[PDB]
Amino acid sequence: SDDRPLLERVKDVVADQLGVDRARINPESNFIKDLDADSLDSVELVMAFEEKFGVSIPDEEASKIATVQDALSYIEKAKS
Numbered sequence: 001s002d003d004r005p006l007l008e009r010v011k012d013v014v015a016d017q018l019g020v021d022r023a024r025i026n027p028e029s030n031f032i033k034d035l036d037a038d039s040l041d042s043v044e045l046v047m048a049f050e051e052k053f054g055v056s057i058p059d060e061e062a063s064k065i066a067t068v069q070d071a072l073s074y075i076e077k078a079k080s
């Protein structure tokens with residue numbers, strides 16, 4: 001009914017994968033621009049969202065997961 005638990009858990013994956021200070025992670029955080037995600041970091045992060053949330057993110061959708069919000073919205077829609 002609100003996105004708070006899934007936002008918490010998305011930020012958990014972002015923090016585990018990228019190692020950045022949790023305080024820096026917000027819905028508008030862009031993985032490449034803000035958190036210095038390189039191409040390898042990005043593939044692994046996508047795969048972690050897939051494993052952690054039991055969702056599928058094919059390469060055509062993966063390219064569009066730019067931000068924390070994108071990932072949250074995608075997962076929410078996948079589970080709907």
Ligand code: NA
Pocket residue numbers: 058059060
């Ligand atoms: Na494809």
Ligand SMILES: [Zn+2]
Pocket residue numbers: 008009012
């Ligand atoms: Zn947590």
Ligand SMILES: [Zn+2]
Pocket residue numbers: 012016
């Ligand atoms: Zn963890």
Ligand SMILES: [Zn+2]
Pocket residue numbers: 043044047
């Ligand atoms: Zn991999």
Ligand SMILES: [Zn+2]
Pocket residue numbers: 066067069070
């Ligand atoms: Zn977006």
Ligand SMILES: [Zn+2]
Pocket residue numbers: 003073076
């Ligand atoms: Zn939502």
